[PDB]
Design a protein around this ligand. Structure first.
Ligand code: K
Length: 294
């Protein structure tokens, strides 16, 4: 069902000197749900109940996001992919996940999770993904009506748009969900970013990390490495496809459709599809996990 209540209360672990927040419920092998930009563990609140009793249900808040600590001092060089990965790799190590891990990933959670899966492939039981950053892309892969905004985030204008106007929380997120979010849901998504200034830097650094036309070179190389690995890996995969979808003209989807040992389902939504079809997504993930854990 829908609803504004979080799935569980947050726990905290200290990572490299900062507190990271996460949800961890139940017993068994883990099902790891990883949000992206500009969301948090809250994104999964109506999906995780569908997996009750299938294992340990975990949803981490990326550093600087959700209820996780900010990285102070912050500025133009803070919250790159590589820094997020350092914090997330250490958090997932500290959670004692075992070697039968199911990943459920979305948006930048998929770039972090795909890379983690490549480096820890001997421990990964299955991968469910949606709105994946599956490979390096080009500006032509964005619908024409979206290009100006993402070019602006990656220009000097992005600082005013995000640090001052908070447009990723206030405009992009609700604009890429067909259902209008409630005031309570918007308050949950706004909370980590209430303060003008560097509190909002994670939501600007993320669009400045999308691997587009070869830039940034380090994320492009990371995505090339996990794209090649995923295209030949025998790990079970669940590709959740959205209709009508958003922010893509289809080339990445056609690449994902070449990946091995994969089941594809289609659900209704634009980009943050968890807010339009949580029951469809949750039921699909639960069926996938039940097949992996008979
Ligand atoms: K619910």
């Amino acid at each position: 069902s829908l609803g504004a209540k979080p799935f569980g209360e947050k726990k905290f672990i200290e990572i490299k000197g900062r507190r990271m927040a996460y949800i961890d419920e139940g017993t068994g092998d883990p099902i790891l749900f990883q949000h992206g930009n500009p969301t948090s563990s809250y994104l999964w609140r109506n999906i995780m109940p569908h997996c009750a009793g299938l294992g340990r249900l975990i949803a981490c808040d990326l550093i600087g996001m959700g209820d996780s600590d900010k990285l102070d001092p912050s500025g133009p060089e803070r919250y790159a992919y590589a820094e997020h990965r350092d914090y997330l790799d250490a958090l997932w190590e500290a959670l004692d996940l075992g070697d039968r891990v199911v990943l459920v990933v979305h948006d930048w959670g998929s770039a972090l999770g795909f890379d983690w899966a490549r480096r820890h492939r001997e421990r990964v039981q299955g991968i469910a993904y949606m709105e994946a950053i599956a490979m390096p892309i080009e500006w032509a892969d964005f619908p024409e009506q979206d290009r100006d905004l993402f070019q602006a985030f990656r220009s000097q204008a992005g600082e005013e748009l995000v640090l001052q106007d908070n447009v990723f929380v206030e405009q992009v997120l609700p604009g890429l969900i067909l259902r209008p979010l409630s005031e309570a849901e918007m308050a949950a998504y706004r909370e980590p970013f209430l303060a003008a200034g560097e509190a909002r830097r994670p939501t600007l650094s993320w669009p400045r990390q999308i691997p587009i036309a070869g830039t940034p070179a380090d994320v492009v190389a990371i995505a090339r490495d996990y794209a090649g690995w995923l295209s030949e890996s025998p790990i079970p995969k669940l590709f959740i496809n959205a209709e009508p979808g958003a922010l893509t003209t289809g080339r990445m989807r056609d690449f994902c459709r070449t990946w091995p040992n994969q089941t594809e389902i289609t659900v209704a939504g634009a980009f943050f599809i968890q807010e339009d079809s949580p029951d469809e997504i949750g039921a699909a993930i639960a069926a996938f996990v039940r097949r992996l854990r008979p």
